[PDB]
mmCIF file of C-alpha atoms and ligand atoms in Angstrom:
data_model
loop_
_atom_site.group_PDB
_atom_site.id
_atom_site.type_symbol
_atom_site.label_atom_id
_atom_site.label_comp_id
_atom_site.label_asym_id
_atom_site.label_seq_id
_atom_site.Cartn_x
_atom_site.Cartn_y
_atom_site.Cartn_z
ATOM 1 C CA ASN M 772 -18.199 25.003 -2.786
ATOM 2 C CA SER M 773 -20.816 23.033 -0.431
ATOM 3 C CA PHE M 774 -18.069 22.373 2.333
ATOM 4 C CA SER M 775 -20.387 22.134 5.474
ATOM 5 C CA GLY M 776 -20.116 21.562 9.298
ATOM 6 C CA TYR M 777 -16.413 22.518 8.905
ATOM 7 C CA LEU M 778 -14.830 24.519 11.933
ATOM 8 C CA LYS M 779 -12.662 27.723 11.291
ATOM 9 C CA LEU M 780 -9.073 27.671 12.346
ATOM 10 C CA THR M 781 -7.349 30.605 10.508
ATOM 11 C CA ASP M 782 -8.541 33.116 7.902
ATOM 12 C CA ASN M 783 -7.965 30.170 5.158
ATOM 13 C CA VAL M 784 -7.871 26.780 7.097
ATOM 14 C CA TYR M 785 -10.971 24.849 7.900
ATOM 15 C CA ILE M 786 -11.191 21.044 9.859
ATOM 16 C CA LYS M 787 -13.854 18.853 9.893
ATOM 17 C CA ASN M 788 -14.038 15.213 11.375
ATOM 18 C CA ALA M 789 -14.906 13.177 8.526
ATOM 19 C CA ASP M 790 -13.347 10.554 6.389
ATOM 20 C CA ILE M 791 -11.815 12.431 3.243
ATOM 21 C CA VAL M 792 -13.464 9.963 0.946
ATOM 22 C CA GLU M 793 -16.784 10.752 2.155
ATOM 23 C CA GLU M 794 -16.392 14.562 2.005
ATOM 24 C CA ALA M 795 -15.297 14.015 -1.630
ATOM 25 C CA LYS M 796 -17.994 12.269 -2.495
ATOM 26 C CA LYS M 797 -20.557 14.874 -1.152
ATOM 27 C CA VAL M 798 -18.507 17.826 -2.284
ATOM 28 C CA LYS M 799 -17.106 16.844 -5.315
ATOM 29 C CA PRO M 800 -14.362 19.228 -4.792
ATOM 30 C CA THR M 801 -12.038 20.995 -7.936
ATOM 31 C CA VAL M 802 -9.226 19.164 -5.945
ATOM 32 C CA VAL M 803 -8.784 16.624 -3.232
ATOM 33 C CA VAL M 804 -5.353 15.525 -1.813
ATOM 34 C CA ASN M 805 -4.006 12.349 -1.563
ATOM 35 C CA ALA M 806 -1.148 11.347 1.352
ATOM 36 C CA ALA M 807 0.948 9.702 -1.343
ATOM 37 C CA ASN M 808 4.339 7.723 -1.442
ATOM 38 C CA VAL M 809 6.984 8.259 -3.914
ATOM 39 C CA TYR M 810 5.912 5.272 -5.720
ATOM 40 C CA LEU M 811 1.723 5.941 -5.724
ATOM 41 C CA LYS M 812 1.379 2.786 -4.781
ATOM 42 C CA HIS M 813 -1.943 3.577 -2.647
ATOM 43 C CA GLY M 814 -2.463 0.723 -0.190
ATOM 44 C CA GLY M 815 -3.834 2.121 3.045
ATOM 45 C CA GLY M 816 -4.743 5.220 4.900
ATOM 46 C CA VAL M 817 -6.048 8.205 2.753
ATOM 47 C CA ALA M 818 -4.319 6.783 -0.329
ATOM 48 C CA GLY M 819 -5.829 3.079 0.018
ATOM 49 C CA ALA M 820 -9.243 4.637 0.949
ATOM 50 C CA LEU M 821 -9.473 7.111 -2.168
ATOM 51 C CA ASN M 822 -8.170 4.446 -4.211
ATOM 52 C CA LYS M 823 -10.687 2.055 -3.041
ATOM 53 C CA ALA M 824 -13.646 4.340 -3.887
ATOM 54 C CA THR M 825 -12.564 4.906 -7.406
ATOM 55 C CA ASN M 826 -12.744 0.956 -7.935
ATOM 56 C CA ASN M 827 -8.953 1.001 -8.685
ATOM 57 C CA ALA M 828 -8.864 3.543 -11.351
ATOM 58 C CA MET M 829 -6.646 5.814 -9.457
ATOM 59 C CA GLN M 830 -4.112 3.012 -9.148
ATOM 60 C CA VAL M 831 -4.193 2.278 -12.828
ATOM 61 C CA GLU M 832 -3.831 5.834 -13.498
ATOM 62 C CA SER M 833 -1.007 6.136 -11.059
ATOM 63 C CA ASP M 834 0.854 3.054 -12.242
ATOM 64 C CA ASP M 835 0.845 4.926 -15.916
ATOM 65 C CA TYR M 836 2.005 8.144 -14.509
ATOM 66 C CA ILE M 837 5.028 6.428 -13.158
ATOM 67 C CA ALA M 838 5.804 4.042 -15.926
ATOM 68 C CA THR M 839 5.955 7.624 -17.774
ATOM 69 C CA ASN M 840 7.927 9.827 -15.356
ATOM 70 C CA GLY M 841 9.439 7.751 -12.741
ATOM 71 C CA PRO M 842 8.958 8.366 -8.620
ATOM 72 C CA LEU M 843 7.850 11.182 -7.057
ATOM 73 C CA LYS M 844 10.259 13.305 -4.475
ATOM 74 C CA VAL M 845 9.601 13.290 -1.123
ATOM 75 C CA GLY M 846 8.185 16.837 -0.744
ATOM 76 C CA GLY M 847 6.861 16.828 -4.094
ATOM 77 C CA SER M 848 3.528 16.165 -5.873
ATOM 78 C CA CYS M 849 1.544 15.375 -8.959
ATOM 79 C CA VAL M 850 -1.827 16.771 -10.350
ATOM 80 C CA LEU M 851 -3.795 13.435 -11.576
ATOM 81 C CA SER M 852 -7.571 13.011 -11.959
ATOM 82 C CA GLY M 853 -10.019 12.796 -9.255
ATOM 83 C CA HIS M 854 -12.114 10.163 -11.099
ATOM 84 C CA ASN M 855 -15.668 10.048 -9.212
ATOM 85 C CA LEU M 856 -14.406 11.825 -6.081
ATOM 86 C CA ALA M 857 -13.223 15.289 -7.460
ATOM 87 C CA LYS M 858 -12.023 17.234 -10.638
ATOM 88 C CA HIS M 859 -8.593 16.522 -9.901
ATOM 89 C CA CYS M 860 -6.119 14.826 -7.200
ATOM 90 C CA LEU M 861 -3.108 16.137 -5.924
ATOM 91 C CA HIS M 862 -0.791 13.376 -4.839
ATOM 92 C CA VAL M 863 1.513 14.919 -2.172
ATOM 93 C CA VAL M 864 4.293 13.098 -0.824
ATOM 94 C CA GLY M 865 5.061 13.909 2.724
ATOM 95 C CA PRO M 866 7.983 12.672 4.628
ATOM 96 C CA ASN M 867 8.175 9.472 6.126
ATOM 97 C CA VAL M 868 9.480 10.031 9.742
ATOM 98 C CA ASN M 869 9.383 6.572 10.873
ATOM 99 C CA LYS M 870 11.690 5.771 7.958
ATOM 100 C CA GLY M 871 14.082 8.598 8.736
ATOM 101 C CA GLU M 872 13.178 10.993 6.297
ATOM 102 C CA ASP M 873 13.496 14.668 6.753
ATOM 103 C CA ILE M 874 10.894 16.183 8.837
ATOM 104 C CA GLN M 875 11.754 19.871 7.132
ATOM 105 C CA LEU M 876 9.942 18.335 4.018
ATOM 106 C CA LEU M 877 6.845 18.415 5.404
ATOM 107 C CA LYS M 878 6.897 22.198 4.845
ATOM 108 C CA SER M 879 7.801 21.337 1.049
ATOM 109 C CA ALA M 880 4.940 19.078 0.906
ATOM 110 C CA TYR M 881 2.283 21.692 1.987
ATOM 111 C CA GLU M 882 3.708 24.183 -0.259
ATOM 112 C CA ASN M 883 2.292 22.274 -3.291
ATOM 113 C CA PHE M 884 -1.301 23.187 -2.040
ATOM 114 C CA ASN M 885 -0.424 27.247 -2.864
ATOM 115 C CA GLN M 886 -0.989 25.863 -6.490
ATOM 116 C CA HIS M 887 -4.385 25.418 -6.050
ATOM 117 C CA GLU M 888 -7.131 28.076 -4.673
ATOM 118 C CA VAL M 889 -9.319 25.505 -3.036
ATOM 119 C CA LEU M 890 -8.808 21.909 -1.801
ATOM 120 C CA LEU M 891 -10.000 19.364 0.202
ATOM 121 C CA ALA M 892 -6.937 17.513 2.111
ATOM 122 C CA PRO M 893 -5.878 15.429 5.044
ATOM 123 C CA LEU M 894 -2.982 16.261 7.431
ATOM 124 C CA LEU M 895 0.085 14.998 5.700
ATOM 125 C CA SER M 896 2.568 12.501 7.525
ATOM 126 C CA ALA M 897 0.167 12.313 10.353
ATOM 127 C CA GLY M 898 -0.434 8.362 9.858
ATOM 128 C CA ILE M 899 1.595 5.491 9.317
ATOM 129 C CA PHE M 900 4.442 8.179 8.319
ATOM 130 C CA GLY M 901 4.925 8.957 11.816
ATOM 131 C CA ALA M 902 4.885 12.506 12.432
ATOM 132 C CA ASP M 903 3.269 14.464 15.164
ATOM 133 C CA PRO M 904 -0.271 15.600 13.884
ATOM 134 C CA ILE M 905 -0.229 18.524 15.975
ATOM 135 C CA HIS M 906 2.919 19.581 14.334
ATOM 136 C CA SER M 907 1.668 18.733 10.931
ATOM 137 C CA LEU M 908 -1.307 20.781 11.445
ATOM 138 C CA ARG M 909 1.009 23.751 12.473
ATOM 139 C CA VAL M 910 3.243 23.493 9.309
ATOM 140 C CA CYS M 911 -0.335 23.611 7.304
ATOM 141 C CA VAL M 912 -1.691 26.570 8.919
ATOM 142 C CA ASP M 913 1.577 28.269 8.425
ATOM 143 C CA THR M 914 2.658 26.970 5.069
ATOM 144 C CA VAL M 915 -0.673 26.952 3.041
ATOM 145 C CA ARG M 916 -2.211 30.298 1.853
ATOM 146 C CA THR M 917 -5.032 28.986 -0.070
ATOM 147 C CA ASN M 918 -7.963 27.642 1.030
ATOM 148 C CA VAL M 919 -7.707 24.194 2.524
ATOM 149 C CA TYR M 920 -10.396 22.321 4.185
ATOM 150 C CA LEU M 921 -9.141 19.362 6.240
ATOM 151 C CA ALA M 922 -10.899 16.111 6.911
ATOM 152 C CA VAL M 923 -9.615 14.205 9.699
ATOM 153 C CA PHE M 924 -11.021 11.079 10.356
ATOM 154 C CA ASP M 925 -10.262 9.768 13.859
ATOM 155 C CA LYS M 926 -12.743 11.623 16.311
ATOM 156 C CA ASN M 927 -10.364 11.443 19.139
ATOM 157 C CA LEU M 928 -7.421 12.925 17.089
ATOM 158 C CA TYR M 929 -9.911 15.812 15.717
ATOM 159 C CA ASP M 930 -11.210 16.567 19.455
ATOM 160 C CA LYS M 931 -7.676 16.891 20.462
ATOM 161 C CA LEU M 932 -6.301 18.999 17.320
ATOM 162 C CA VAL M 933 -8.884 21.676 17.797
ATOM 163 C CA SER M 934 -8.802 21.903 21.523
ATOM 164 C CA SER M 935 -4.876 22.635 20.761
ATOM 165 C CA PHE M 936 -2.619 25.971 20.623
ATOM 166 C CA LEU M 937 -1.130 26.005 17.393
HETATM 167 C C1 LIG S 1467 -4.375 12.338 10.520
HETATM 168 C C2 LIG S 1467 -4.647 11.623 9.551
HETATM 169 C C3 LIG S 1467 -3.532 10.197 9.298
HETATM 170 C C4 LIG S 1467 -4.119 9.183 8.260
HETATM 171 C C5 LIG S 1467 -5.316 8.882 8.178
HETATM 172 N N1 LIG S 1467 -6.431 9.783 8.398
HETATM 173 C C6 LIG S 1467 -7.394 10.333 7.742
HETATM 174 N N2 LIG S 1467 -8.178 11.243 7.433
HETATM 175 C C7 LIG S 1467 -9.064 11.451 7.017
HETATM 176 N N3 LIG S 1467 -9.778 10.869 5.969
HETATM 177 C C8 LIG S 1467 -9.107 9.349 6.199
HETATM 178 N N4 LIG S 1467 -9.607 8.495 5.274
HETATM 179 C C9 LIG S 1467 -8.800 7.385 5.526
HETATM 180 C C10 LIG S 1467 -8.209 7.713 6.512
HETATM 181 C C11 LIG S 1467 -7.926 9.130 6.797
HETATM 182 C C12 LIG S 1467 -5.994 10.938 9.487
HETATM 183 C C13 LIG S 1467 -6.186 10.338 10.975
HETATM 184 O O1 LIG S 1467 -7.497 9.665 11.129
#
């Protein structure tokens, strides 16, 4: 793909200080990952921002998905359209550690990435779900074996992540 300006972290994990929405608009990847909740209610953070960029089409599609299939599992995922941003969106639910959900489920969440050869993705559980971002990055690197391009919006956090020893 046309991923540009990324820093290599490992054999298969690359990182960039960017809004995942802007990266998706530029690159139009096969798969963009959403940091979803089990109800696919895309209110804020990555999910709200991706949905807004689709003019709410992501939410309309998600509502039909839930009406048919019910909620996702914590640690689970589903593949839906990427609309104008990507071919597909992999909606992945990391644990909400601020609500007592088991942080071990973060590994299960990242395992979903292994079903896709290349992904543009955020750090799961590292926003309002309250997991330590360095921990989320470590779980990502230790779990995902396919090619993952991570976008981290916050500059201060990015700078910290890339100066940390995993
Ligand atoms: C570690 C993440 C926590 C959630 C929010 N973050 C985003 N990263 C990339 N693109 C994004 N778009 C909108 C939000 C957003 C990261 C922090 O900046």
